[PDB]
Amino acid sequence: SVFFKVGDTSRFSVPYVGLASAYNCFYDGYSHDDAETQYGITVLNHMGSMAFRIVNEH
Amino acid sequence: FNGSETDVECFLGRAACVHVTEIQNKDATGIDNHREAKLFNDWKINLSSLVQLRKKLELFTYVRFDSEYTILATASQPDSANYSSNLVVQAMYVPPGAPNPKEWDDYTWQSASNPSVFFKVGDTSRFSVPYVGLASAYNCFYDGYSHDDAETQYGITVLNHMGSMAFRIVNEHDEHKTLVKIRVYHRAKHVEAWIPRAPRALPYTSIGRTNYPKNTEPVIKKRKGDIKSY
Amino acid sequence: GLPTTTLPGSGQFLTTDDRQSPSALPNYEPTPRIHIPGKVHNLLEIIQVDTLIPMNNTHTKDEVNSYLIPLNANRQNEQVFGTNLFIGDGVFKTTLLGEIVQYYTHWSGSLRFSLMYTGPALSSAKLILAYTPPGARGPQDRREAMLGTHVVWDIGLQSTIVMTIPWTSGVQFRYTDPDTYTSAGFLSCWYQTSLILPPETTGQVYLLSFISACPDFKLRLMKDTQTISQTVALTE
Amino acid sequence: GLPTTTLPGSGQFLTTDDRQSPSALPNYEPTPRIHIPGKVHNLLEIIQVDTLIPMNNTH
Amino acid sequence: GLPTTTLPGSGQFLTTDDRQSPSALPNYEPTPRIHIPGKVHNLLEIIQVDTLIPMNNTHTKDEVNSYLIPLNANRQNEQVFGTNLFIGDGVFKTTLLGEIVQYYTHWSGSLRFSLMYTGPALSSAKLILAYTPPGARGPQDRREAMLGTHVVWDIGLQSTIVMTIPWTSGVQFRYTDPDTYTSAGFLSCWYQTSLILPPETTGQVYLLSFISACPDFKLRLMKDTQTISQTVALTE
Amino acid sequence: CGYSDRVQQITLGNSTITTQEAANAVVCYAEWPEYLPDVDASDVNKTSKPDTSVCRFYTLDSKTWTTGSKGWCWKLPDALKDMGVFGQNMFFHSLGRSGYTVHVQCNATKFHSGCLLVVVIPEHQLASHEGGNVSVKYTFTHPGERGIDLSSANEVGGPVKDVLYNMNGTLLGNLLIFPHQFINLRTNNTATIVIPYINSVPIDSMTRHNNVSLMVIPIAPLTVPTGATPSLPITVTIAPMCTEFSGIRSKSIVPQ
């Protein structure tokens, strides 16, 4: 998590967070024939999830 | 691998929010709100608050820190509008074995050799307090009182005290309302651990005393059916 | 004299960034480092120890008997063990390997299942214990377990049975999000023969089951570890 | 100890500028690089292939 | 030309940080350094000097007699000295070792207790003086002191008696917070025999007691040193 | 010739125990009980060496493992308070360095089925029977030679007697990263744990500070054959090895 002034920036470097050895941008197959996570959206090679909020009051 | 991911130094060395607090500065006395959380605050540092309610450090018995308190102070009173006009905040690391302030305009903010810093509200300040330990390691998990003699307090064992943080405002003039939220993030460097210890079952019920809480729910899970799985 | 630029990301406060910071006590010798035993450098040697597994945790209130797998006489070709090998869930959750794997994220490595018998010296039994790999439906009886990678290591002369658990890579690692999928591994045990009790025994004997990780173990990313949806700000 | 100056263009945010930035996961081994076929380094070898031309696209 | 970043803790004002700062008089030769005697580099050589101890400070107003331990005739097996060895408190507080150890914090090191007799040349006495270590209850009479590490070094031929005070580590150092615990050390003296006064002496003789620190002394952290709850802002 | 287990004379001072069945040894960690905390202070030494006369095998009272039994817990440097020359050195001095060697023996016939867990827990802080912001006042902690005696001896004001939380909040099968060995009546009848000294301060009072709790607990219940006695004895012996004290040429008398 980072904190910065409004109107300024912040620079990241998130490394390759991939389940597969490459990002399967274009994949054929579901997740299982078992329980099967969701569908062939293939969110299994998820990259991350950014969250933004304010620490202030009143 | 010799990569700092599952080793001890990476394990405990992350920075975590401890001791959220909220102070202000009004006047000498003014309106009768002086003592509790206004005009100053002392913490008496203890990692016993929210290191995931004392877990990863309680997994070991003997540790040694080198702390980096990073004080994030911010103006709860709308900083966007005003309430920030040169609002210089004073932090102070009162070491163990030194008197604690209990007033905003008190003698031990300016006294001798008490490390105090000054920074703008909405900015930070980085420390490095060395290993201030009475024992050669921090006895996080200790059996014994302090004496069979006079005996200092009890087996809380505040003898291996780490320090005491003090926060206050150097400003004046009661005509208005301000409010300042201060949030310190402890980070431990060069963490050397010893003597692995079995983890707790429940979330705790006391600081220092290794008590397990009464009236417990089952910490372990029943089988889904029988010993027959699936 | 030294010209310089700006950088976007100025005034940044990374919580996680290793930066050397100046000392509040710049000149102070600490209490010096002495040698005390059991120095630890890694969680691998923490989880190298066979702790135990609560398998008979099917009673409501938690007691000592949660680890005692109950063994009766005159039963064969029927169930003894049975578990999904999803560490961090079910019966492995409250082991030391349990909260360690609840600490990190995606993991890898072979294991060291152990097993030990608590009964009389003049007692004998044959117990087939079988492993089925993740992605395979576990066996239904002693027959189908025997066609699996069946292990006997019987009772009557040998008490301590250890079996390594080989790891197989699924989608490059192990899924560490809470689901009840059935492709995590499966270990179970069957009476190959009935338990032969000594004369006038008149009771039950038990087994004790341990688990740990072989040095091949691996732990990759770190997580927040709520486990209770944690927030307590009590200070004294 | 180190005297320095300013530069006009401070607080600048070039979108296109190659600057090394600090890591949010500073210590994390990724899924390792394996060999898979058809490695590409350039669009020249992309457009080296005769595709086809729609010439009778008058319908 | 030189790209740079920010650092959190910018605009910081550490009071205690050693940073070289530019000169208001950048070109000015001062009054040059000459040699004058008694150059000091350390407080150790300050506290190497046996000052004195006020032991007979049991009178109300402070006079010269505060240091004179009173010695009478025809008393034996009864009290002469008696003190807790808590420097910074009690009777050692107002020595030079007193405000020096009130300056710092946790300390360590052996001491150099001295003792000197002020009486006539043709007078004799035997005085047992005994040390008991911290953590031990001090002796009640000359008997129990003699079973301690008893020291006689009598009066009648020798006047200056020095005894080293060995230091023992308790919980790694000495407690430097104001309490009246009784595990700080204990030194006391007894008449082994009655004082033999010269004929028609008709009065009292006295002893003089000094204290300092041996070169083994150690002072570790520094404190604020209120001692009066200090604040005076008077300027002229 | 034949079986040649290490059952020869371990005689040591007044102690001539030599009762070893399957005499395998598990030490606590890689560190042996070692005397020297340092080399010297570059000075002539009168260092207190009581290892010539402290290294006796001070046994304890025997305790009867019934079927309805839960466990026993002794605070190790304070179990030997009212006994031996070691106890009189403990009150006689204040501070001492004491490595221990604990030999727990259980008499059991061939016909008895059960298992025990011995475990040596460093700095075992206790959980109270109150279970709040208060613990035992260290009167009920270390009775000495009698132990906490977890087996159905419940009390008020002091520690809890809950055996799964082992007065610690921890878990029973999770306890084995402490040094331990299982007494399996199929295999062995005794257990040895070699305890080196363990404290963040190199020299410490054992009257004030409880270094080690020793627990012997039945994991599997004891099933005797019927017609026999439903009780088996546990005997525990302590040999304080490479033991050192501090109060040299200093201590006269303290009675208590």
PDB file of C-alpha atoms in Angstrom, chain E residues 75-214:
ATOM      1  CA  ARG E  75      31.746  -0.354  72.429  1.00  0.00           C
ATOM      2  CA  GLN E  76      32.245  -3.632  70.620  1.00  0.00           C
ATOM      3  CA  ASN E  77      30.214  -5.970  68.429  1.00  0.00           C
ATOM      4  CA  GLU E  78      27.996  -3.060  67.421  1.00  0.00           C
ATOM      5  CA  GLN E  79      27.371  -0.712  64.568  1.00  0.00           C
ATOM      6  CA  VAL E  80      29.810   1.701  62.964  1.00  0.00           C
ATOM      7  CA  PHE E  81      28.842   2.018  59.290  1.00  0.00           C
ATOM      8  CA  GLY E  82      25.897   0.778  57.270  1.00  0.00           C
ATOM      9  CA  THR E  83      24.692   1.654  53.803  1.00  0.00           C
ATOM     10  CA  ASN E  84      22.930   0.402  50.725  1.00  0.00           C
ATOM     11  CA  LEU E  85      25.311   0.608  47.781  1.00  0.00           C
ATOM     12  CA  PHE E  86      22.837   2.373  45.504  1.00  0.00           C
ATOM     13  CA  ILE E  87      24.828   5.206  43.987  1.00  0.00           C
ATOM     14  CA  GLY E  88      22.543   7.991  42.927  1.00  0.00           C
ATOM     15  CA  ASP E  89      20.514   7.533  46.093  1.00  0.00           C
ATOM     16  CA  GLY E  90      20.852   7.944  49.833  1.00  0.00           C
ATOM     17  CA  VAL E  91      24.273   8.948  51.075  1.00  0.00           C
ATOM     18  CA  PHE E  92      26.193   8.423  47.822  1.00  0.00           C
ATOM     19  CA  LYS E  93      23.949  10.808  45.884  1.00  0.00           C
ATOM     20  CA  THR E  94      25.943  13.923  46.740  1.00  0.00           C
ATOM     21  CA  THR E  95      29.340  12.619  45.729  1.00  0.00           C
ATOM     22  CA  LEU E  96      30.930  13.355  42.368  1.00  0.00           C
ATOM     23  CA  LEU E  97      30.219   9.747  41.495  1.00  0.00           C
ATOM     24  CA  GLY E  98      26.706  10.692  42.626  1.00  0.00           C
ATOM     25  CA  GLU E  99      25.784  13.320  40.041  1.00  0.00           C
ATOM     26  CA  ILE E 100      27.812  11.531  37.389  1.00  0.00           C
ATOM     27  CA  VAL E 101      25.755   8.356  37.783  1.00  0.00           C
ATOM     28  CA  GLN E 102      22.668  10.554  38.042  1.00  0.00           C
ATOM     29  CA  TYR E 103      23.653  11.856  34.631  1.00  0.00           C
ATOM     30  CA  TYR E 104      23.754   8.693  32.713  1.00  0.00           C
ATOM     31  CA  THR E 105      21.569   5.524  33.064  1.00  0.00           C
ATOM     32  CA  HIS E 106      22.490   1.801  33.503  1.00  0.00           C
ATOM     33  CA  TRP E 107      26.063   1.431  34.658  1.00  0.00           C
ATOM     34  CA  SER E 108      28.686  -1.192  35.408  1.00  0.00           C
ATOM     35  CA  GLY E 109      32.045  -1.519  37.071  1.00  0.00           C
ATOM     36  CA  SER E 110      33.938  -2.185  40.259  1.00  0.00           C
ATOM     37  CA  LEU E 111      34.563   0.544  42.809  1.00  0.00           C
ATOM     38  CA  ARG E 112      37.311   1.762  45.133  1.00  0.00           C
ATOM     39  CA  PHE E 113      36.053   2.334  48.652  1.00  0.00           C
ATOM     40  CA  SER E 114      38.621   4.063  50.830  1.00  0.00           C
ATOM     41  CA  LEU E 115      38.697   4.715  54.547  1.00  0.00           C
ATOM     42  CA  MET E 116      40.959   6.837  56.726  1.00  0.00           C
ATOM     43  CA  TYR E 117      41.269   7.379  60.481  1.00  0.00           C
ATOM     44  CA  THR E 118      41.433  10.734  62.281  1.00  0.00           C
ATOM     45  CA  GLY E 119      42.708  10.168  65.797  1.00  0.00           C
ATOM     46  CA  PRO E 120      45.787  10.194  68.004  1.00  0.00           C
ATOM     47  CA  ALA E 121      48.979   8.358  67.206  1.00  0.00           C
ATOM     48  CA  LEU E 122      48.956   6.341  70.446  1.00  0.00           C
ATOM     49  CA  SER E 123      45.456   4.949  69.941  1.00  0.00           C
ATOM     50  CA  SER E 124      44.427   1.470  68.832  1.00  0.00           C
ATOM     51  CA  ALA E 125      41.224  -0.261  67.739  1.00  0.00           C
ATOM     52  CA  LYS E 126      40.116  -3.278  65.708  1.00  0.00           C
ATOM     53  CA  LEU E 127      37.344  -2.538  63.208  1.00  0.00           C
ATOM     54  CA  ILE E 128      35.760  -5.315  61.178  1.00  0.00           C
ATOM     55  CA  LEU E 129      34.197  -3.876  58.032  1.00  0.00           C
ATOM     56  CA  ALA E 130      32.148  -6.240  55.926  1.00  0.00           C
ATOM     57  CA  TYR E 131      30.741  -6.321  52.415  1.00  0.00           C
ATOM     58  CA  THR E 132      27.696  -8.373  51.529  1.00  0.00           C
ATOM     59  CA  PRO E 133      26.839  -8.797  47.839  1.00  0.00           C
ATOM     60  CA  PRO E 134      23.598  -7.527  46.271  1.00  0.00           C
ATOM     61  CA  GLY E 135      20.814 -10.017  46.825  1.00  0.00           C
ATOM     62  CA  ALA E 136      21.962 -10.919  50.310  1.00  0.00           C
ATOM     63  CA  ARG E 137      20.564  -9.645  53.600  1.00  0.00           C
ATOM     64  CA  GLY E 138      23.203  -7.660  55.446  1.00  0.00           C
ATOM     65  CA  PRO E 139      24.624  -8.889  58.739  1.00  0.00           C
ATOM     66  CA  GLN E 140      23.127  -8.017  62.095  1.00  0.00           C
ATOM     67  CA  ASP E 141      26.245  -7.984  64.302  1.00  0.00           C
ATOM     68  CA  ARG E 142      30.013  -8.481  64.301  1.00  0.00           C
ATOM     69  CA  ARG E 143      29.480 -12.254  64.384  1.00  0.00           C
ATOM     70  CA  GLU E 144      27.460 -12.480  61.178  1.00  0.00           C
ATOM     71  CA  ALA E 145      29.724  -9.895  59.550  1.00  0.00           C
ATOM     72  CA  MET E 146      32.774 -11.985  60.435  1.00  0.00           C
ATOM     73  CA  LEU E 147      31.232 -14.958  58.671  1.00  0.00           C
ATOM     74  CA  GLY E 148      30.975 -12.571  55.711  1.00  0.00           C
ATOM     75  CA  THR E 149      33.995 -11.335  53.785  1.00  0.00           C
ATOM     76  CA  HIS E 150      35.305  -9.560  56.850  1.00  0.00           C
ATOM     77  CA  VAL E 151      38.081  -6.979  56.632  1.00  0.00           C
ATOM     78  CA  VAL E 152      39.954  -5.771  59.679  1.00  0.00           C
ATOM     79  CA  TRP E 153      43.020  -3.628  58.556  1.00  0.00           C
ATOM     80  CA  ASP E 154      43.186  -2.347  62.092  1.00  0.00           C
ATOM     81  CA  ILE E 155      43.706   1.012  63.721  1.00  0.00           C
ATOM     82  CA  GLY E 156      46.880   1.690  65.647  1.00  0.00           C
ATOM     83  CA  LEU E 157      49.482   1.224  62.975  1.00  0.00           C
ATOM     84  CA  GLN E 158      47.530   1.748  59.742  1.00  0.00           C
ATOM     85  CA  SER E 159      45.207   4.618  58.940  1.00  0.00           C
ATOM     86  CA  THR E 160      44.346   4.421  55.240  1.00  0.00           C
ATOM     87  CA  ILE E 161      42.212   1.383  54.447  1.00  0.00           C
ATOM     88  CA  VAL E 162      41.135   0.797  50.848  1.00  0.00           C
ATOM     89  CA  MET E 163      38.803  -2.000  49.788  1.00  0.00           C
ATOM     90  CA  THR E 164      37.831  -2.720  46.213  1.00  0.00           C
ATOM     91  CA  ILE E 165      34.145  -3.377  45.629  1.00  0.00           C
ATOM     92  CA  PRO E 166      33.662  -6.112  43.016  1.00  0.00           C
ATOM     93  CA  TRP E 167      30.747  -5.706  40.681  1.00  0.00           C
ATOM     94  CA  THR E 168      28.311  -8.539  39.989  1.00  0.00           C
ATOM     95  CA  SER E 169      25.874  -8.507  37.059  1.00  0.00           C
ATOM     96  CA  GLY E 170      22.252  -8.884  38.136  1.00  0.00           C
ATOM     97  CA  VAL E 171      19.814  -8.619  35.260  1.00  0.00           C
ATOM     98  CA  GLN E 172      22.703  -7.676  32.888  1.00  0.00           C
ATOM     99  CA  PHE E 173      23.101  -4.195  34.514  1.00  0.00           C
ATOM    100  CA  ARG E 174      21.983  -2.032  37.443  1.00  0.00           C
ATOM    101  CA  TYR E 175      18.433  -0.768  37.873  1.00  0.00           C
ATOM    102  CA  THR E 176      18.434   3.018  37.490  1.00  0.00           C
ATOM    103  CA  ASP E 177      14.819   3.848  38.302  1.00  0.00           C
ATOM    104  CA  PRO E 178      13.809   5.212  41.741  1.00  0.00           C
ATOM    105  CA  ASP E 179      12.920   2.289  44.029  1.00  0.00           C
ATOM    106  CA  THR E 180      13.992   1.237  47.536  1.00  0.00           C
ATOM    107  CA  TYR E 181      14.785  -2.372  46.718  1.00  0.00           C
ATOM    108  CA  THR E 182      17.448  -3.982  48.887  1.00  0.00           C
ATOM    109  CA  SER E 183      19.586  -5.809  46.317  1.00  0.00           C
ATOM    110  CA  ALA E 184      22.125  -3.093  45.540  1.00  0.00           C
ATOM    111  CA  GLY E 185      24.998  -4.154  47.802  1.00  0.00           C
ATOM    112  CA  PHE E 186      25.649  -3.506  51.465  1.00  0.00           C
ATOM    113  CA  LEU E 187      28.792  -2.342  53.255  1.00  0.00           C
ATOM    114  CA  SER E 188      29.040  -1.936  56.998  1.00  0.00           C
ATOM    115  CA  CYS E 189      31.596  -1.813  59.789  1.00  0.00           C
ATOM    116  CA  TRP E 190      31.746  -3.146  63.337  1.00  0.00           C
ATOM    117  CA  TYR E 191      34.012  -2.703  66.314  1.00  0.00           C
ATOM    118  CA  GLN E 192      35.893  -5.937  66.631  1.00  0.00           C
ATOM    119  CA  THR E 193      37.160  -4.570  69.906  1.00  0.00           C
ATOM    120  CA  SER E 194      36.490  -1.438  71.871  1.00  0.00           C
ATOM    121  CA  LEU E 195      38.363   1.687  70.881  1.00  0.00           C
ATOM    122  CA  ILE E 196      41.410   2.155  73.098  1.00  0.00           C
ATOM    123  CA  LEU E 197      41.741   5.876  73.612  1.00  0.00           C
ATOM    124  CA  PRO E 198      44.948   7.483  74.882  1.00  0.00           C
ATOM    125  CA  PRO E 199      44.857   8.645  78.528  1.00  0.00           C
ATOM    126  CA  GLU E 200      42.791  11.784  79.286  1.00  0.00           C
ATOM    127  CA  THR E 201      41.588  11.992  75.690  1.00  0.00           C
ATOM    128  CA  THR E 202      37.985  12.786  76.778  1.00  0.00           C
ATOM    129  CA  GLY E 203      36.169  13.095  73.484  1.00  0.00           C
ATOM    130  CA  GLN E 204      35.609  11.498  70.093  1.00  0.00           C
ATOM    131  CA  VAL E 205      37.714  10.476  67.138  1.00  0.00           C
ATOM    132  CA  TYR E 206      36.429  10.172  63.614  1.00  0.00           C
ATOM    133  CA  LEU E 207      36.907   8.281  60.378  1.00  0.00           C
ATOM    134  CA  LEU E 208      36.874   9.646  56.851  1.00  0.00           C
ATOM    135  CA  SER E 209      35.362   7.610  54.041  1.00  0.00           C
ATOM    136  CA  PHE E 210      36.014   8.077  50.341  1.00  0.00           C
ATOM    137  CA  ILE E 211      34.536   6.527  47.206  1.00  0.00           C
ATOM    138  CA  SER E 212      35.382   6.404  43.517  1.00  0.00           C
ATOM    139  CA  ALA E 213      35.280   4.064  40.546  1.00  0.00           C
ATOM    140  CA  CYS E 214      38.014   1.664  39.390  1.00  0.00           C
TER     141      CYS E 214
END
